[model samples]
Target: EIDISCVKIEQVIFGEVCSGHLKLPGKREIFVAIKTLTEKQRRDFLSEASIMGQFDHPNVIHLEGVVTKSTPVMIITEFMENGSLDSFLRQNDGQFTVIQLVGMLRGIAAGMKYLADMNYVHRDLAARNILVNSNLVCKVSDFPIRWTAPEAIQYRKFTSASDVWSYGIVMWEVMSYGERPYWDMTNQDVINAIEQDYRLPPPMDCPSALHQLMLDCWQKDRNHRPKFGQIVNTLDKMIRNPNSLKAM
Candidate 1:
C-alpha cells in the first residue's frame, strides 16, 4: 500500500474520487480525481479506469497511475473542472454556435470510435456523463451503466454495439443542446417504445444524414448499429457546412 503522504489531496468535489486543485506541492491549478477505497468501491473504480485506460486519445480523459492501499485504492485522472456537459450547458442557458456543437459531436464520435476498437461500450453516454476541461475540450466520462449482455451488471464487459446506441443518444443530447433524454418519458416506457420503431424526432439543426445515423444506432438488433469509424467520418463530412444550430 502506498503512503497517503506520498500524494497531497485538496478540497474534494462530487465524490471522494474527485477533488478541486492539487493538494500536493509543485502542482499547477489542476483538479485531482482519485478513487480512495477498495472492494465494491475499488471494483467500480478499476472498472471505470479500465475502460478509460484501454483507450488513450485526446477525446477521452487520460488515466494516470493508480495507487493501491489497504484502506483506499486511488485512480488518478485529469479533472474536468467544467463538470458534466449537462450542467455546463445549463449554466450557458442551452446555447452554442454551430461549430461548438460540431466540435463536441466530433470529440464524442472520436472517443466512441476508440472504445469500439477496444470492444468497450459506454452504456450511459449522454450530456451528463460528458465532461469538459478548462479549454472546453469534451471527453466521455462515467461508465457505471456501460453496455453488455443484458444483466451482466457485475462484469461490466461493455459491448461495441450498445456503446453505439449510447453514442446516438449523445448525439441527440448535443443537438438538443442538453435537453432531457426522452423529454418526459419513464425509463421503462422509453425502452418499450424504442423496442419498436419509435424514436426521438430529429432536431432542426440535425441534418437528415445524421438523423438516419441516429435511427440506425437505436435499431432493435444491436449489430445493425453503425460503426464508430463510420459515424465519425460521416459527421466529419457533414459538419463541413458549418451551418446553424439544431432546433430546441
Candidate 2:
C-alpha cells in the first residue's frame, strides 16, 4: 500500500511509482503507473479522481493511492499481470479461440454494464484501456477520457453516448486484438469518416452478429446507438446462442 514515484525509462529512475513484476503480499505482483505532472496536471488529476470516485465496477481498476509529493503526482493501482490488452495481443499476434473470446467479452461487457448503470460513459474505451491479470481476467483501465455529452465534446465534456462510440472501437480493438484503429487510417481520417457516418469494415473472423453490433454502434445517429447494457445483452446472446447470429 505504498506509492512509489518514478521518471520515464529514457530518464534515470527517480522513484518507483510502479515497478513491473514486483512481488506483493499473498504472492500478488505490482505494476506501477506513473504520469509526471505539473501544477495544472495535479489539478486535473484530482478532478479525474473525483470523477472516478463516483463510479465503481469489478472491471474498473482500483486506485490504491496517490502522491502529490513536493513535485508531481502519481497513480497507484492494481498491477495488471499481463500488462495492457494491446501489449498482450501484440505478443500473442491477435490469435484467440472463440471460447476464449467469449470468456473475455464476458468480463468486458460486465464492466461496461456497470458503467452504463452508473450513467457514466468511458469515452476512451479501447484495447489499450483493458488490462489482463495473471488469472487472465480482463479489467477496463484508463479514465482520462469520460464521455458526458455531445455538447460536452465541443466544450471538452464527454457523454454516455459518445462513450458508446468509443466502446464500439473497443470491441473492434478486441476483435482485432490490438490492430491499429481503423487499420491504416490517420487521425484526421478517423475524425472525418466518423463525422461522416463512415467507419472501418469489420475485422477478420469477427462474427456477423458482432460485426452488426459494431455497425449499429457507428450509426451517424448517436441516439440510435445501443447502450452499454444493451451491448452486453446483445453480445451475451451471441455468446450463448451462436446460431442466433445466423438470423442476420
Candidate 3:
C-alpha cells in the first residue's frame, strides 16, 4: 500500500534494504527502512513481505507497506536507529547493567515466543540478526554457523526447538558484550566440541539463573529445550525479582 512516490531512498543499509524517509503531506516525515527488489527477485521480495506483514508484535520489526506497482518494488519498515544488536553491544561493551541486559533478552524472547505461537520457526536466530532502536528496544530482524543449533547444522533440521538452541548462543553473545562465540575455534571445531557435550561458559558477571537458562536451551535433546514461552516467563520472573539473578 506504500506509494513509491512518498519514499525517498537514501543509502543502502544492508543487503537489498536501504535507509530512507517517508514524507507524507501535512505530517512529520518518518524514518523508514526500505527493501528494494528487482523484477527477477520479485517473488522472493513478495514472499518476505507476506511473512512480515502477518507479524504484529512490539519486539518484531513492523512492516509499513510495499510498492509493487512501480519499478524497484519495495518493502518499507520502521527504521532502527541503533542497528544490529551485536554491533551495538560492541559499541557499548559492558556499559549496561545486568538487569538492563536481561530486559533486552526478555524482549528478544518475547518476540520469538510470538513467532513460535504463530507456528513460524526462525531458521536463523542470532544477536547479529536482531535490531536495536534508539531506546535500546531490541527487535527480531532476521543468520549461520556459530549461532546455529547442532541438529540444524548436522541434519538440516530447523524447528522451534532448534531456534531455542540458537537463542542460547545469542544470550552468550549479549552477556559477553558481543564477543564472538567459541572464539578462535573453527566451525568444525565448534561442531566437535558440541558433539562432546561442551557448552559455553557464562560471560563475566552473567547471572547463574540466566546461565542455567542458556544451558537448558543447549540441551542435547531438542525436546528438552524450553519453549520460547517458557523462556519469556523465566526472564519475566528475573525482572520481577532481581535477587534471583544474584547467585552468580
Candidate 4:
C-alpha cells in the first residue's frame, strides 16, 4: 500500500486520475500515472487491481498500488512514455516500417498469450487499451472494461473465444494507425453487421497475410478463430520472412 501523503498530485490525467513524477522520501523521482476515482469507479478499479497485481511481465503495465483507505480513492501504475498505441500510431503515422509495426503487434500478442495461459480473458483487447513504453514495446492495458464479445455483448457470455473477436479489432486498429473501428458506426450497427457476417476491410496498405490473420481472428465461428499462440507464430513468420509481407 502506497502512502497517500507521499504522492503530490500534479496534472489531472483523467476525471479522477492524475499524472505526475512520483518521488518517495528515499527513492529518486519516477514517472507515475495516478488514477483517483469516485466511489463507484474506485470499486471497479480495485476489482481490476486484483487482476493487475497478479500480472508480471515486460509487456504488461506494472501496478504500483492503490489508496483505498482515503477519500478520492487512487490507483497508481507505471507511466508509459509513449502512451496508448492508438494515439501513438496516429501521431507517428507512416513513420514506422512494416517490421517495426509488426514488432509492436508481436509484443501485444505475446502479452495476451501470457494472459490466456493464465486463463485470464481480456474482453476489451483493442489498440486503445495497449500502452507503449519509451522502448517501443507495447503492453496491454485497461482491465476493468473487459466487456466486449458477441455472446457477452448480445447475451452476456464471456470466454477466451470472445476475446479472439476483440483481438481482431485490435489488429484493425494497429493496421489503420488508430482509425476508429466501423468509422463512426454505432455499437448497435456493429452488432448488426457482425450478425450478417460482415467484417472490417483490410486497412489501406495493410499486408494481405496480416489481414488474413486478422480475418482468421474475426471468423464468425469463435471456435475457428486462431489462438493467441497461433497469432504470435504467424506474426513471427512475417517478421522473419520479410519477403512474405505482400500487400492486398
Highest TM-score against the true fold, candidate = 3
Better of 1 and 4 by TM-score: 4
Where does candidate 2 stray beyond 4 Å? 1-17, 20-38, 67-74, 144-157, 244-248
- Among all candidates shown, the one with the greatest lDDT: 3
After the best TM-score superposition of candidate 1, give how far the Cα of residue 104 lies from its true spot, in angstroms.
0.7
Segments in model 3 whose C-alpha atoms lie over 4 Å from true places: 10-16, 23-28, 38-40
lDDT of 2 by residue, 1-248 (tens): 23343222122132243433234345545455543445575577666656665656778776655555544455556567687887787788646765566567668878877877777667677777788987778887766222122333456646666677677776777777777776666655566666665666777777777778877776666789887778878877777887755442
TM-score of each: 0.78, 0.74, 0.93, 0.87
How far is 246's C-alpha from truth in model 1 (Å)?
Answer: 9.1
lDDT of 4: 0.82
Q: Answer with 3 or 4, whichever has the higher TM-score.
A: 3
**lDDT against the true structure, each candidate:** 0.68, 0.65, 0.89, 0.82
RMSD of each: 4.4, 5.1, 2.0, 2.8
How many residue pairs clash in model 4?
1
Q: What stretches of model 1 exceed 4 Å from their correct place?
A: 1-6, 20-31, 38-40, 70-72, 144-158, 243-248
Worst 10 residues of 4 by lDDT: 144-153
Compose the digit string of candidate 3's lDDT tens values, residues 1-248: 87777899888852476899997667688999987755456676687778988999999999888898887778888999899999999999989999999999999999999999999999879998899998889999761787888888889989999999999999999999999999999999999999999999999889899999999999999999999999999999999999999988
lDDT score at residue 64, model 1, on the 0-100 scale: 60
Candidate 3 minimal-lDDT segment of 10 residues = 36-45
